[PDB]
From Swiss-Prot:
It is found in: Cell membrane. Keywords: ATP-binding, Cell membrane, Membrane, Nucleotide-binding, Transmembrane, Transmembrane helix, Transport. Signal peptide: none annotated. Residues 4-238 form the ABC transporter domain. This is Uncharacterized ABC transporter ATP-binding protein TM_0288. Its main location: membrane. Belongs to the ABC transporter superfamily. ATP binds at G37, P38, T39, G40, S41, G42, K43, T44. The lineage of its organism: Bacteria, Thermotogati, Thermotogota, Thermotogae, Thermotogales. One of its GO terms (molecular function) is ABC-type transporter activity. One of its GO terms (biological process) is transmembrane transport. It comes from the Bacteria. GO terms for cellular component: plasma membrane. It comes from Thermotoga maritima (strain ATCC 43589 / DSM 3109 / JCM 10099 / NBRC 100826 / MSB8).
Amino acid sequence: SGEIEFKNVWFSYDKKKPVLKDITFHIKPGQKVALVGPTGSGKTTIVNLLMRFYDVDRGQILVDGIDIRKIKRSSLRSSIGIVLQDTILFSTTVKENLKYGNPGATDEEIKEAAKLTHSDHFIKHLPEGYETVLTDNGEDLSQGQRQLLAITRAFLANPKILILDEATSNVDTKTEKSIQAAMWKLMEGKTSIIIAHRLNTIKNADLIIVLRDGEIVEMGKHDELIQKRGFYYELFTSQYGLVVEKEAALEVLFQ
């Protein structure tokens, strides 16, 4: 479970000038894949097609050997889990938010998962704990904490495919290490597609897919790509020695 294949995929929203051109790659079950490339390189569109917000104009996409066009839509969506950088939540208790993705779970199973994903602690400090109402869709919580809940939520849902933003950096250091431990736990034994901009996650990915102008221009592990002086090398060194501000991430991979 979690196998993903794009075979000669072409796509355009306009049906005028293509956005994606001959996208071809294969992901083995349980791999961690970094999609890297500047804004508008095709990252978003690849993920939009995998979630089947649109069908491809040419080629095909397979999830575990089956064309996604032939998969029941509710079964495709519930087998894919997304965590964004700026998560939106529902205006109920913390417990109820977590219980999306697994409504049938017991109250203890919720706490176990929240424990396994390092969000239990901050939840307990909320004025009413797991019963705390998250008014205005999580307004009171910090961006990191909302991301924490989404991770625990997705952990409960146990999808076979994860589509992930990197952890937010506009967080306290304690919460960041917390989020990263939580994401590692979430990714365990699952196929993970990461819209990557952190050096560390790009360096440790099982596979890097480098996109430029809607095409794959390099594909492989960091050690392979870094010894040729192509586009990846340019992205990786674009910040080298430059002072500011968030040294962990390549700024050109989201701006």
